[PDB]
Amino acid sequence: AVLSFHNICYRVKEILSNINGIMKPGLNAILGPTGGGKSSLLDVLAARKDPSGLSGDVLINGAPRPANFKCNSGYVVQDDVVMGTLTVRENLQFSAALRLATTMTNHEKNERINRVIQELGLDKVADSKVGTQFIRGVSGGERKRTSIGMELITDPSILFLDEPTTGLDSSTANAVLLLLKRMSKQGRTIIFSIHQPRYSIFKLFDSLTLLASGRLMFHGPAQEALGYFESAGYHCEAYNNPADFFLDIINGDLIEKLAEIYVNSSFYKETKAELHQLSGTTSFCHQLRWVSKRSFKNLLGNPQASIAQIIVTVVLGLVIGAIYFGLKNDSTGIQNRAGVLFFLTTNQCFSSVSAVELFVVEKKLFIHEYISGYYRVSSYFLGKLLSDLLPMRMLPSIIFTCIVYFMLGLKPKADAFFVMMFTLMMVAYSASSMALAIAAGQSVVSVATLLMTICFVFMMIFSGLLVNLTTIASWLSWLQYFSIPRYGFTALQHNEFLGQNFCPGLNATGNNPCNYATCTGEEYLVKQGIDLSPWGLWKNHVALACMIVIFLTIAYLKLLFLKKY
Amino acid sequence: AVLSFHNICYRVKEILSNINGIMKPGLNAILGPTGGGKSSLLDVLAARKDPSGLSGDVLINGAPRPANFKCNSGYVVQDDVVMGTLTVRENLQFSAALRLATTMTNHEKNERINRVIQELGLDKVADSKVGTQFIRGVSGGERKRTSIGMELITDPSILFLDEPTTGLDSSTANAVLLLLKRMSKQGRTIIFSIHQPRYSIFKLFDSLTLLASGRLMFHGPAQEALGYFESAGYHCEAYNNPADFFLDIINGDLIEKLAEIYVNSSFYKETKAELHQLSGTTSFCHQLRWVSKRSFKNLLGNPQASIAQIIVTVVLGLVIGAIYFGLKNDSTGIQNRAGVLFFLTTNQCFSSVSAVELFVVEKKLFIHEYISGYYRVSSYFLGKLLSDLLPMRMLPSIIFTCIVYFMLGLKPKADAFFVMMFTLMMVAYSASSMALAIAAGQSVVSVATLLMTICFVFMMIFSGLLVNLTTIASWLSWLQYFSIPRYGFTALQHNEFLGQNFCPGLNATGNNPCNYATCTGEEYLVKQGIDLSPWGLWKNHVALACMIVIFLTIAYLKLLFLKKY
Ligand SMILES: Cc1ccc(NC(=O)c2ccc(CN3CCN(C)CC3)cc2)cc1Nc1nccc(-c2cccnc2)n1
Ligand SMILES: CC(C)CCC[C@@H](C)[C@H]1CC[C@H]2[C@@H]3CC=C4C[C@@H](O)CC[C@]4(C)[C@H]3CC[C@]12C
Ligand SMILES: CC(C)CCC[C@@H](C)[C@H]1CC[C@H]2[C@@H]3CC=C4C[C@@H](O)CC[C@]4(C)[C@H]3CC[C@]12C
């Protein structure tokens, strides 16, 4: 194929202006400083910029662009979207399992990818972890071509690369481009935007589209690539870089002085002729099965934050298991259970600040994938929390009630012990479902951690311990239902002080003199304003279920309405 | 003033090796890549590297370095050390007020610095805020020139500049380079290390000392600056950068091939001739008066970290003031009073995370000023907390207990109001001192926060409310004394349960049947196990003062034993 664009303009102040470059198959390039449009019109061609400010017409061999054009062409980006704790043969496995595996069977995807790993120089390191900045692995010179093949699995026709060789250890930074030379001969239109090449590839190109000050510059066809500026007064000369002086008139030795050449130039007079010549979603249930495989294999591969909520949980169980040990039934038994039941509820809230890193640590990965048509939004959101949020906020609840229960000496039944295990694994979801809502769809975390714990302290006040709720008169008992650690703390106190006594040496079973005593259980709950009825126990657990579905929806309601551009 | 160094070696693996350069008065330079040794030998000549790993010698006009060599030579650095929210005239005033003017009075410093601001291009914007990243102001081309004049006040001999043009908006990047030429004509030996110049001032220098791979490289003299590489095979050619092709040898068109030409070059053999020829704390009381004037001015002009700790104090005072309001003396008066006293002492303890930014955010400021001999460490530390710690930890305490005391209805005495205002501003310093102890002398905040709020939860348990302390049996009750909000909570509970009744309609002054009642005040305190005597109240305050003196001391001790190099 062949790309072209005529009379392109754009606004957010008008950013770009009328440019009319052509783009033949081969190996193109975009040049210029960072302030110009070296990173702008790449997002115009690949349907990445917003179609509001776009005015001109961009063509693909005379025909206009299809309605599915962005999901057939690669967009290898600068910041690497390859997953860290994953195998390379597993990483290309994930790309092949979504874009093209609708009809071909499971021994047809593995022969197409072996055609790719036999390219790229990859068969030596084909079964290693790619490594992160935190864990050593495959070096940075070999991960950029690893991300190239992830969008080469489907058969493309344009590879919109996005400045590969920046911060890429220049001794082997050419190894990406000499690789790009040999793959360009098969009929691929490599269109990218390199960042400050010195001299070496200035002959090893096919067509430049240098831009400066975000306005306009040609030199579309370029193998001579320098002859346009040696007749304009401002000459690049002996002992001068050719690729740096061209934009040095804004660097201080006007750009309008070299802009005005193109009314009477040597390349504009032929390109307007051709540009005026030609002027006239699959298998939903397969998705969240395979999306579930990455986030689970990511957790096993990185055992530094996974065990970090297991050790600090079972250590904290033993400290509460050692401070409290054999709590008695004396006069200091009401206060001794009011604390240890308050600590288990509040720790299940405040240790759920670490769910902000479930969506915001890889927000750059998500927007690139959904715009490339891998999976639907609801398949990501129903699959992500089903794989990481559930089995990391459930097992650190049942270990944290199995250790503590037979060390304190609570009510030693069988059904009343499976409720305390149930309420902690329900309040920890309804605490984490709050953190998922005010985080998803952002870029930083230091405005969604100072905001969340400043709202988790206003929930800690109305909790039936520091207030004694049935004393605020009218206009501040309607904030009482908005606090998550209430409903866990009430249901934990309901099955705890039923049928117990705290006045040993006397008896008040049915003969109760001497008021202002609080020595039996069932009068203590009356004073704290909670119902003495078996419906009143399960009233909280149907409230947290409605607190989860409300909060989890407005996460998924805001993952749809985000700027996917 | 003339520098000379012969056969320098340096080990942390030896990074550096034998270098043989001579530095003439004029305007020198240091070139090369960032991974090499351009940023390494600047800290060797300017006495910033430690003299341990150094084996070679440096000479100032044949004499070695005196014991006071770093206290006459400025070290203008690449990241700015100018105070952001301060005016330029007072900023250069502070630089003059410490180094030289102990004998002259206050009408000689402005006589010298008016000559300085008449240079430098300062006479337009001499009286504004210089600004920072977060708050705007004077542009970057004027902020870097302010640091130059800041260490130009005392009459120097060498200005060891430290890569000025890093990220410095190239159209006026030559302006500071043009400014350095004119001041150098009067006996200023400028030694700096530029970062990738294009072509222009490469000829407008006096003596390069280009280096690469941290090993060695020559061209000491520089007036032709290119005549060496046209005789070495790897010739810099027409239409090629001369500034890069000298160091493009690290990219591979071998660096060591050029080093073998250095045993037979035209500059190795005559430089060894001369180097083998020539080889054969003031007014301490005045200091902390003036140091406190800066940081107090840094609170006035920056109303984003000062009034932010007043609004969240007074919007919290009403929320506490409205939840509890007119607390009674009936049977739910104990729990309703122990809550709000627990929430006041812990809120002063978790409001200590906002004081670890008091030393950490300006460590790069403190290291540069102490090695240049501005002030002693005991003047900086004792001058810091007098200005930024005292009037910002006390004023959000007495506004927090005045607005709530009559709002709740506590004991309406006169002296019992001056204990609650006193104890909260006594627990606040001891809380802020502990956050000063495990932060002072570090680089990142996110280690001294997840280590400190993991310790201020081990103090929130042993706090007289969630434990009922006389049940921890033997071997964890020795951990009872290591917790800061215990001492603030007991002394607040001591003067608030003394002399009241929580048993309306009955009376237990000397007639108390019906045990487990807690109808009087003094039965509640003995049930918690605190001393019911005027010694036990003031026992906590003398314990808190011993906590302050211990923690403030190790803040001062770990400031001394720091790697100031
Ligand atoms: C078990 C508990 C009970 C109460 C509290 N918090 C408070 O008692 C409290 C009091 C006042 C404020 C208000 N603060 C005022 C100033 N502004 C700026 C911020 C909020 C906040 C919290 C924390 C905890 N525990 C807790 N909190 C956070 C984290 C952890 C934790 C535990 C284990 C592993 N990792 C983290 N544990
Ligand atoms: C703004 C959003 C996030 C918070 C929504 C709070 C609401 C939805 C929560 C707080 C209190 C909860 C209610 C408390 C009482 C009951 C019991 C029963 O009669 C129906 C459910 C119902 C009515 C709960 C439904 C969910 C509930 C109404
Ligand atoms: C490193 C620090 C925090 C712990 C060291 C202990 C210091 C800080 C604290 C902990 C317990 C405190 C002691 C507890 C008991 C008393 C009461 C009286 O007899 C004199 C003060 C004295 C003796 C306190 C002095 C300060 C003290 C010793």
Residue numbers in the entry:
A (entry chain A), B (entry chain B): 35 to 46, 61 to 301, 328 to 354, 370 to 654
Paper passage:
ABCG2 transports uric acid and plays an essential role in the pathology of gout, but also confers resistance to a variety of chemotherapeutics including topoisomerase inhibitors (i.e., mitoxantrone (MXN), etoposide, topotecan, SN38), anthracyclines (i.e., doxorubicin and daunorubicin), antimetabolites (i.e., methotrexate and 5-fluorouracil), and photosensitizers (i.e., pheophorbide A). There are more than 200 known ABCG2 substrates which have highly diverse chemical structures and functions, and the substrate spectrum of ABCG2 is substantially overlapping with and yet distinct from that of Pgp or ABCC14.
Three-dimensional (3D) classification of ABCG2 particles bound to imatinib demonstrated a single predominant conformation with the TM helices in an inward open facing conformation. The final cryo-EM structure of imatinib-bound ABCG2 at an overall resolution of 4.0 Å revealed one imatinib molecule bound in the inward-facing cavity between ABCG2 monomers. Although bound in a similar location as previously seen with the inhibitor MB136, imatinib occupies significantly less volume at the dimer interface. Thus, in the presence of transport substrates MXN or SN38 a significant fraction of ABCG2 particles appear not to bind the substrates and remain in the apo-closed conformation.
